[PDB]
Amino acid sequence: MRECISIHVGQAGVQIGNACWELYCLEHGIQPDGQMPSDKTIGGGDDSFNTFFSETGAGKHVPRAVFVDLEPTVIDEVRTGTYRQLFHPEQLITGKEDAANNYARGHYTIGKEIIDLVLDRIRKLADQCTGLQGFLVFHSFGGGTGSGFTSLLMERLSVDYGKKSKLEFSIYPAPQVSTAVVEPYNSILTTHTTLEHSDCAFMVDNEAIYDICRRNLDIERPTYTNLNRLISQIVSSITASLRFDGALNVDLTEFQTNLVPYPRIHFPLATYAPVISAEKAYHEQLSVAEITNACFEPANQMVKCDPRHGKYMACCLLYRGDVVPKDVNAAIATIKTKRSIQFVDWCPTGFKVGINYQPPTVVPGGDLAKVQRAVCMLSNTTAIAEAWARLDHKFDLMYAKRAFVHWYVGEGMEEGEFSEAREDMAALEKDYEEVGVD
Amino acid sequence: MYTFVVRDENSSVYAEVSRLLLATGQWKRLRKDNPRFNLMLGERNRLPFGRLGHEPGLVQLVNYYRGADKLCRKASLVKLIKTSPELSESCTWFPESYVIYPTTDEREVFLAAYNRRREGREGNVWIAKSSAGAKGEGILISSEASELLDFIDEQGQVHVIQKYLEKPLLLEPGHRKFDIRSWVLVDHLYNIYLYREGVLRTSSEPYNSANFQDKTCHLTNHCIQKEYSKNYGRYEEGNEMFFEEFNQYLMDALNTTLENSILLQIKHIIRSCLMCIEPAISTKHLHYQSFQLFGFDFMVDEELKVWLIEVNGAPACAQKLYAELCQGIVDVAISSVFPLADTSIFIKLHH
Amino acid sequence: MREIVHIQAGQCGNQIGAKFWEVISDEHGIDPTGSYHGDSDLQLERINVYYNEATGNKYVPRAILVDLEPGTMDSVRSGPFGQIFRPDNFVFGQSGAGNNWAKGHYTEGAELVDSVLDVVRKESESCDCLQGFQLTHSLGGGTGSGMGTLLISKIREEYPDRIMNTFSVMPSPKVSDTVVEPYNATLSVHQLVENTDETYCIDNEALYDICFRTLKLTTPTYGDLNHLVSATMSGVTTCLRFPGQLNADLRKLAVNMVPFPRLHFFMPGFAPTVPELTQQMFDSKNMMAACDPRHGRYLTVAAIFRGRMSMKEVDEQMLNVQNKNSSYFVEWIPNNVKTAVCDIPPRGLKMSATFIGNSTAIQELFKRISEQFTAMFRRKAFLHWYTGEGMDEMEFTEAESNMNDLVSEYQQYQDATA
Amino acid sequence: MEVIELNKCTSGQSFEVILKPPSDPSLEEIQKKLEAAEERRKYQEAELLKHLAE
Ligand SMILES: Nc1nc2c(ncn2[C@@H]2O[C@H](COP(=O)(O)OP(=O)(O)OP(=O)(O)O)[C@@H](O)[C@H]2O)c(=O)[nH]1
Numbered sequence A: 001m002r003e004c005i006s007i008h009v010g011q012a013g014v015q016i017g018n019a020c021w022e023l024y025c026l027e028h029g030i031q032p033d034g035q036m037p038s039d040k041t042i043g044g045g046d047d048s049f050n051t052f053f054s055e056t057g058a059g060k061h062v063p064r065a066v067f068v069d070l071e072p073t074v075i076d077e078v079r080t081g082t083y084r085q086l087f088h089p090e091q092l093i094t095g096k097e098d099a100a101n102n103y104a105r106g107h108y109t110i111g112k113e114i115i116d117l118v119l120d121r122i123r124k125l126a127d128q129c130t131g132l133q134g135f136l137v138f139h140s141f142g143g144g145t146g147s148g149f150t151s152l153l154m155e156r157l158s159v160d161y162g163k164k165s166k167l168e169f170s171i172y173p174a175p176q177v178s179t180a181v182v183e184p185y186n187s188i189l190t191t192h193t194t195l196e197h198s199d200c201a202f203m204v205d206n207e208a209i210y211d212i213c214r215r216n217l218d219i220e221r222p223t224y225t226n227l228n229r230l231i232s233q234i235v236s237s238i239t240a241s242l243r244f245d246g247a248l249n250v251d252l253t254e255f256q257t258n259l260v261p262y263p264r265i266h267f268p269l270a271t272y273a274p275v276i277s278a279e280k281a282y283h284e285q286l287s288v289a290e291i292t293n294a295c296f297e298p299a300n301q302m303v304k305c306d307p308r309h310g311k312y313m314a315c316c317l318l319y320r321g322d323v324v325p326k327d328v329n330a331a332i333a334t335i336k337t338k339r340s341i342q343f344v345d346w347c348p349t350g351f352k353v354g355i356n357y358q359p360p361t362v363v364p365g366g367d368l369a370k371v372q373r374a375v376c377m378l379s380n381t382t383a384i385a386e387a388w389a390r391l392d393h394k395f396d397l398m399y400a401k402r403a404f405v406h407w408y409v410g411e412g413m414e415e416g417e418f419s420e421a422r423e424d425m426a427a428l429e430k431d432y433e434e435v436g437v438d
Numbered sequence B: 001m002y003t004f005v006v007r008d009e010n011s012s013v014y015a016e017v018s019r020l021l022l023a024t025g026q027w028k029r030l031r032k033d034n035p036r037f038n039l040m041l042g043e044r045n046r047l048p049f050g051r052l053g054h055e056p057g058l059v060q061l062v063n064y065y066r067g068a069d070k071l072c073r074k075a076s077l078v079k080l081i082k083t084s085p086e087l088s089e090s091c092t093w094f095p096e097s098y099v100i101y102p103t104t105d106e107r108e109v110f111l112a113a114y115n116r117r118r119e120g121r122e123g124n125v126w127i128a129k130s131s132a133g134a135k136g137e138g139i140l141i142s143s144e145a146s147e148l149l150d151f152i153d154e155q156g157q158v159h160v161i162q163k164y165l166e167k168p169l170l171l172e173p174g175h176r177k178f179d180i181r182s183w184v185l186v187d188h189l190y191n192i193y194l195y196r197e198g199v200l201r202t203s204s205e206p207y208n209s210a211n212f213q214d215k216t217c218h219l220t221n222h223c224i225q226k227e228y229s230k231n232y233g234r235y236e237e238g239n240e241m242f243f244e245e246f247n248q249y250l251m252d253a254l255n256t257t258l259e260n261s262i263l264l265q266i267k268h269i270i271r272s273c274l275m276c277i278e279p280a281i282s283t284k285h286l287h288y289q290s291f292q293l294f295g296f297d298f299m300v301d302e303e304l305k306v307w308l309i310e311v312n313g314a315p316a317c318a319q320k321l322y323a324e325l326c327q328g329i330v331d332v333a334i335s336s337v338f339p340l341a342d343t344s345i346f347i348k349l350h351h
Numbered sequence C: 001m002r003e004i005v006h007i008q009a010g011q012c013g014n015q016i017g018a019k020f021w022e023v024i025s026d027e028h029g030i031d032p033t034g035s036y037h038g039d040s041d042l043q044l045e046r047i048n049v050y051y052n053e054a055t056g057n058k059y060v061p062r063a064i065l066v067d068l069e070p071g072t073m074d075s076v077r078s079g080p081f082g083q084i085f086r087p088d089n090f091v092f093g094q095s096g097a098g099n100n101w102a103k104g105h106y107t108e109g110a111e112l113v114d115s116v117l118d119v120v121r122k123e124s125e126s127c128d129c130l131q132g133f134q135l136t137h138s139l140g141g142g143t144g145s146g147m148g149t150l151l152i153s154k155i156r157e158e159y160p161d162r163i164m165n166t167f168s169v170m171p172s173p174k175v176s177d178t179v180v181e182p183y184n185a186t187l188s189v190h191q192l193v194e195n196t197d198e199t200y201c202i203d204n205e206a207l208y209d210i211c212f213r214t215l216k217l218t219t220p221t222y223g224d225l226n227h228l229v230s231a232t233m234s235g236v237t238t239c240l241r242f243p244g245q246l247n248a249d250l251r252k253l254a255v256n257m258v259p260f261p262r263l264h265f266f267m268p269g270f271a272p273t274v275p276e277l278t279q280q281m282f283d284s285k286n287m288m289a290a291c292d293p294r295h296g297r298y299l300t301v302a303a304i305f306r307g308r309m310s311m312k313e314v315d316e317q318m319l320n321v322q323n324k325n326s327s328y329f330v331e332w333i334p335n336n337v338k339t340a341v342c343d344i345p346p347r348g349l350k351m352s353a354t355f356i357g358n359s360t361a362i363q364e365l366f367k368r369i370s371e372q373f374t375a376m377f378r379r380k381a382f383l384h385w386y387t388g389e390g391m392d393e394m395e396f397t398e399a400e401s402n403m404n405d406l407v408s409e410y411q412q413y414q415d416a417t418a
Numbered sequence D: 001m002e003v004i005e006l007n008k009c010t011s012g013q014s015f016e017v018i019l020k021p022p023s024d025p026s027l028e029e030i031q032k033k034l035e036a037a038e039e040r041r042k043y044q045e046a047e048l049l050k051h052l053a054e
């Protein structure tokens, strides 16, 4: 058994981390006090769920997680929340002045002051690992800590742990829930600095999560808690293969080899179904072919783009609940009849499929209904480059006039890092084009 | 009120649609890159489809279908025809055609059938075309394959070669060739609307079987007959004959209708072309919605068989009909999504 | 825990400042004794931003009161809450400033300023993590204007990495009670251009018209004008005093509101259904700076709604004003209007809507002052009272050039396209 | 439609479905990066403190 360490950076990263860990505990049967009645290996074990949970002699199960934010408002609600006793105060790290939605301030000014303490506390968790896989990093693109400090930590993790794999879960900025005008700048600057250190990054556009919550859960103005509860679902179905017995994506390395044939194009599109509101008296279950077919509708994607106008290079199907391989191959065959699914010449037209018999777990009181079969699709389609085109254009409009740039220079960044980062994503947008376009 | 932007200012059709929307009193025009628009009358090349449908609180509409290029360009159309089961490489209404690149390429395909009919001494006059050429240039006809792709390796753009219509229906008086242009509007619901009024764009010099040299007996394009033509304008003004008079000619001269004799074939070719790509370009459940106006180009042989020769995704109208069509665009494609305050000119082709 | 230090200088500053502490003390449930007796406990979650907590859970405003004459500060010590303030934070002189910016900045104010920064420095070191400073003052007088901007420049020297905010009453287009106000205002604007991060511009003619035309008070007073200001100061600082996340501290607000460092002068507005408020909030008749926004374009905008309301409607209504009036927002700053909603309403009202615009139409205020300044300075009228306190003429020229440059910048960005 | 690499266990099943076959900076350089940024900051603070001393 090989371990994974999760790192939660900034407000978004932490609040999403705390929704993921609550969901993990319900899925594995761990209580708020870290006690696992189903666990008969006391104070130890090489079970696959031990990839995410340590174990004390007293029988507590501790997340292999570190939370870091440069202001304490958010992490302290973890210290006082219903899962407070899950963590050791040494896994939670606070500044007192945050990055003020300023990449340069989280990366250069404040990141320099705190990066070495975060690495120490990470190292203490890595010390008790018999064979570390790598890290899953949760953060936002728009925040100053999420963008600025995250990219600095990835640079340092690539040397302190040069061989380990690094996976990202990144929140792409959406104006309907965004906190700052500068989020396009922070997104581009951190993507450029982080790109050659990330092995595989699953980006969630808050816009898509927002309108799913509106349309399918009938929440008229979704909150972060509503967004995070759905986000945790998709995250859990992606990490389930690391925490449960199986033979697909059992190692962080498999994510890259199965989904990322091109190192720079390491941004898989996630699509999830079914998202059904829990208060609707009830619904008649959907087929395997129906939720599988929902995975090709843009209204269910974590990022709103049109895969029909690009090419796939890989596709995984992660089912949970009452599903068997017969019904899957039937849905796939019939779905390739009616859908535009064009792979690249250089790759086979195929689907890797995983099934876990445990139906999806839902949080009590949440807005999502207990289903008995769900599916998450991971497809590496060039269509996700539409998200880079949107951001790059917003970046361009403001930067042509140097709007807000003085806030970054004032922190010691040079104007040239702006042009450098923008030229990188210009290349990336073109790389995406040569692959998926004729 | 509603907002819209104009990003191809040299479009005759949507130049007039813009003018009619402003006369509404319910539409205001922002400029190029104001993103807070309801409707985008977009550019022809590299229109940013990825930036549409991402403005909170605004239903957005664009006058182009992402992906309609695979049908509106020659190389793409032939690949579409031959590789789509719905449309068959044995397609009856599309002329024998082959994609061939200068200097995936059907050039040895092409002369296999060339010699096959030389063996049978059947008609062996082909034609080579491209998307880059215009002005009746980058176009050539001849009987011997040898120097017609001696002629396109002479260029560096992809060109197609296509069996030439050697026995076309020829108007009299004149003994002259012609094309038929039909305008079709696909709205956001993918209703296929056919403009009741077409036009025959005509040649004004008798069709000369004997030599392909001078391309004014051969190429019915509006401009070459306006530009290298003695009698451009004699029989009909502007070499534009419209359906009412063409109908009367076929009746008087061959005892048949237009609707019967030709239109049923046109409507069938349109349905087949656009339903074949619906799964690939429909915006039914997309964050933005599309409509688009196409111009189909058909030719008719002597047996009253209709042939499709190309589809135009950014078409121009005929001067007599700009008013009627352009307002039909507003009522069916624009005011369909953006209602205004308070018979028909299209043929719906069901599906 | 992200504490602010409040300073009020001159008569105007101390009056406005005094009523500001009345309004937000009631909002946070503090009584004139400094003891809390409120209903909810969001009243106290961020009370440390503006109040020092002291013995017996007595809450003392982190406020410093400054003037060159004792009169106006006897009035505040007499007022409803005059007893809430720390008596050592009254820092006062006896000479006065004589409506003379030079006296406030260079001579009379020089004698008193080091005692003010002594109190500022003791407040600041009782701060777990000082956020910045906010000053209330007039630009037309001598103390708030001349000594106010001296305090600012001295505070920037000791705290160069902290935010500096001002609420600044500016000369009015038609109304004046002193002859030399153009000189005092121009000399202070030059100081503010370079040493503040955010300035809220207020003038009395606009505040008066609201009082008379809208709230139908037959004979408005400075007291009425001052309740208006203090109500909108409570509004613009709601996101700093109550749990939220948009514009929750002074630096984050600055990053979202100031695209270019010199254009940090804002138009405040206030109002009074949800479609009702959002129409009011954007009307010229509801802003307090006597500039019409339709004569410029918004570089950024911050809208704050208070009370309990359908945030779905608020989100929908703001979107409609943006898409309805796109012409008045720069197209090269995407999504430049940000909305915050806090549940606790102001007293008397149930749904508030305060507006913070960074509009290039503020150009008009600086050109009004520039035209007055030049008409006097071209003839050196009244200048001997300033050079008589030691000033050079070139100090006036430089201030004039800088305010004219500021006007050119606003026009530059008013014109820019994408 | 081949169904290769089938694996089963108590918790679930895995397999592949083919439809059609085909046709970093040093640690030293990092702090040198953060020190050049810290230099530029203090050069800026110094010029302001000099300007205010003036
Ligand atoms: N989905 C989701 N998005 C969030 C959450 N919190 C913040 N965001 C988004 O992230 C952006 C703001 O970044 P934050 O994470 O709050 O900033 P930060 O990382 O804490 O950095 P600083 O506060 O500037 O130091 C906006 O685009 C928000 O919409 C969250 O809990 N869930």
Ligand SMILES: CNCCCOc1cc(F)c(-c2c(Cl)nc3ncnn3c2N[C@@H](C)C(F)(F)F)c(F)c1
Pocket: C175, C176, C177, C204, C205, C206, C208, C209, C220, C221, C222, C223, C225
């Ligand atoms: C239709 N557009 C006209 C706008 C009228 O604008 C205003 C503003 C004010 F601030 C006052 C005002 C008030 Cl309200 N209270 C006062 N107490 C002592 N002085 N003083 C005031 N002004 C001094 C100069 C005066 F009285 F000498 F005129 C005022 F009267 C009109």
Ligand SMILES: Nc1ncnc2c1ncn2[C@@H]1O[C@H](COP(=O)(O)OP(=O)(O)CP(=O)(O)O)[C@@H](O)[C@H]1O
Pocket: B095, B127, B129, B134, B135, B162, B163, B164, B165, B166, B178, B179, B218, B219, B220, B221, B297, B299, B309, B310, B312
């Ligand atoms: N296989 C064929 N046989 C006979 N004539 C043909 C032919 N293909 C094309 N033509 C004729 O040559 C002319 C020019 O061909 P084509 O339509 O492709 O040029 P073009 O792209 O400029 C038309 P438009 O200007 O409307 O886009 C046509 O009007 C047609 O009459």
Ligand SMILES: Nc1nc2c(ncn2[C@@H]2O[C@H](COP(=O)(O)OP(=O)(O)O)[C@@H](O)[C@H]2O)c(=O)[nH]1
Pocket: C009, C010, C011, C012, C013, C015, C016, C097, C099, C138, C139, C140, C141, C142, C143, C144, C145, C169, C171, C176, C177, C204, C222, C223, C225, C226
């Ligand atoms: N709103 C308001 N404005 C005032 C008040 N007192 C003075 N002013 C304004 O400020 C100017 C006089 O400045 P003042 O505060 O008396 O000067 P200072 O004491 O030297 O700072 C005039 O233009 C008035 O419009 C007041 O109590 N309220």
Ligand SMILES: [Ca+2]
Pocket: A039, A040, A041, A042, A043, A044, A045, A046, A047, A055
């Ligand atoms: Ca165990």
Ligand SMILES: [Ca+2]
Pocket: A158, A162, A196, A197, D024
């Ligand atoms: Ca690496």
Ligand SMILES: [Ca+2]
Pocket: C111
């Ligand atoms: Ca003295």
Ligand SMILES: [Ca+2]
Pocket: C114
């Ligand atoms: Ca001293």
Ligand SMILES: [Mg+2]
Pocket: A010, A011, A069, A071, A098, A143, A145
């Ligand atoms: Mg934060």
Ligand SMILES: [Mg+2]
Pocket: B131, B312
């Ligand atoms: Mg053409």
